[PDB]
Amino acid sequence: PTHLSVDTKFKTEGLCVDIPGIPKDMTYRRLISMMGFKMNYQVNGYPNMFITREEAIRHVRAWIGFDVEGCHGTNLPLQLGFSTGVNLVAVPTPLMYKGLPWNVVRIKIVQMLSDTLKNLSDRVVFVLWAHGFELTSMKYFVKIGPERTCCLCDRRATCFSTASDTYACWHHSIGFDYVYNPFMIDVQQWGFTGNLQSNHDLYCQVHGNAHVASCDAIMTRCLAVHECFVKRVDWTIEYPIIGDELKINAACRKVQHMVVKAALLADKFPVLHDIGNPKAIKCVPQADVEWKFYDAQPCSDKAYKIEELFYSYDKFTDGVCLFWNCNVDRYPANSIVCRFDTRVLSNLNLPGCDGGSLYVNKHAFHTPAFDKSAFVNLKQLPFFYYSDSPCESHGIDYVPLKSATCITRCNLGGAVCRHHANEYRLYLDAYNMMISAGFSLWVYKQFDTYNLWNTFT
Numbered sequence: 001p002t003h004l005s006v007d008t009k010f011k012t013e014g015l016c017v018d019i020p021g022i023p024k025d026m027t028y029r030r031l032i033s034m035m036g037f038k039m040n041y042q043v044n045g046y047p048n049m050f051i052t053r054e055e056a057i058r059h060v061r062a063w064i065g066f067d068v069e070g071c072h073g074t075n076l077p078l079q080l081g082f083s084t085g086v087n088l089v090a091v092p093t094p095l096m097y098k099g100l101p102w103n104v105v106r107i108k109i110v111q112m113l114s115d116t117l118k119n120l121s122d123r124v125v126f127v128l129w130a131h132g133f134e135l136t137s138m139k140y141f142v143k144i145g146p147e148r149t150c151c152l153c154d155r156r157a158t159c160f161s162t163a164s165d166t167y168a169c170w171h172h173s174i175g176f177d178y179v180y181n182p183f184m185i186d187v188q189q190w191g192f193t194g195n196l197q198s199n200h201d202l203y204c205q206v207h208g209n210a211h212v213a214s215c216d217a218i219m220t221r222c223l224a225v226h227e228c229f230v231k232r233v234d235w236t237i238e239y240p241i242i243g244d245e246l247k248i249n250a251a252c253r254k255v256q257h258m259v260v261k262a263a264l265l266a267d268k269f270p271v272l273h274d275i276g277n278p279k280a281i282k283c284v285p286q287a288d289v290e291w292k293f294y295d296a297q298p299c300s301d302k303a304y305k306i307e308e309l310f311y312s313y314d315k316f317t318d319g320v321c322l323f324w325n326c327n328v329d330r331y332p333a334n335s336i337v338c339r340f341d342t343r344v345l346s347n348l349n350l351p352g353c354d355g356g357s358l359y360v361n362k363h364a365f366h367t368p369a370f371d372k373s374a375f376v377n378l379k380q381l382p383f384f385y386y387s388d389s390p391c392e393s394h395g396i397d398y399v400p401l402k403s404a405t406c407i408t409r410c411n412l413g414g415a416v417c418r419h420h421a422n423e424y425r426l427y428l429d430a431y432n433m434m435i436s437a438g439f440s441l442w443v444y445k446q447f448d449t450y451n452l453w454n455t456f457t
């Protein structure tokens, strides 16, 4: 039950305006044949061009919305739209390109997909709101066959070249002209009422409709992300490592310990309200503070309202509140906050629904749109490094460190020791790693690193 059987029925009602007379009774087997492809009763890793919802969710990094609009059916030009914002016009002789024959259009498609996907996934999943022209145009830039490996590496093959008769992955596809063994899924098979725009606009106000193919491609993928990662959530699905996931996650634990420990030392809060992930552990386990946990799963739709989190019947105004990746609409003044900036560009952060983003780091977290007004009661947390550890070098070469933000006994004494200089530069790299990944740090306005110097006396 892991792959989509080709004998599964395909609802054709959405196709009958582009393809009048299409049979109501239709399987994927007959649909693929109708699209001009032949599968040959082949057991070589490619059982179906179309995939299940579950397989699509596991390969969300490969999702490319795809739409085709009749520009004027073999006799008229076609506008090819992709969720990358690209519009290509193919002739049978926000970006918008003029009409060109299929033999040059397919070269642009391979280049576009390869640059988009090489650092994201081992494949492409075309996300469709299928009405006909997009399915019948695939024969002009798609080749299928047995699963293969790249001619220059061990990755699976995603492209084919008619010039050299060879195969390549996204990384080595320069000059290739055909997409090889792509995957696809028709969102309209999921049981919607009404057209694409009416269903998309139920949940998203960020993507308009300029009535060009790329806008439909964007809305289609956006609707799919909402259905699979907003209204539905599955945190059991694991995703492969494609970047600095481990360093980013390790940096997050180190910065969280550093910031909370220093806030407790500087202001001596009697109680800390740890609001968020119900799997949370004390990040400063040796602190004397009264540590109270409050369970809140990561919100995937709208940011939590602070009124429903705190109230409905309790003294969150006592001490300090810790919101580590707990997105609320407005943080109280006595808060320590880590909030993911959905606007960040990285291979881990995919475009999301209604201004949000889909952050995929081991697991997929759809995150509500970043909002600067949520931090009005707070200020940005400045960088600093604090350590009460002994100045002792145990066991890399050294240039003396000078920094006003190395809060250690040795710097209080006027000369940073080598150990705390090593730890400072290691923490600075971790801090910059986490900030670059899109995380932002905010703190109550009274926070002052000057209060940490007298923790050495």
Ligand SMILES: [Zn+2]
Pocket (backbone or CB within 6 Å): 150, 151, 152, 153, 154, 155, 168, 169, 170, 171, 172
């Ligand atoms: Zn390769």
Ligand SMILES: [Zn+2]
Pocket (backbone or CB within 6 Å): 200, 204, 205, 206, 207, 218, 219, 222, 223, 352, 353, 354
């Ligand atoms: Zn949208």
Ligand SMILES: [Zn+2]
Pocket (backbone or CB within 6 Å): 390, 391, 392, 408, 409, 410, 411, 416, 417, 418, 419, 420, 421
């Ligand atoms: Zn030192």
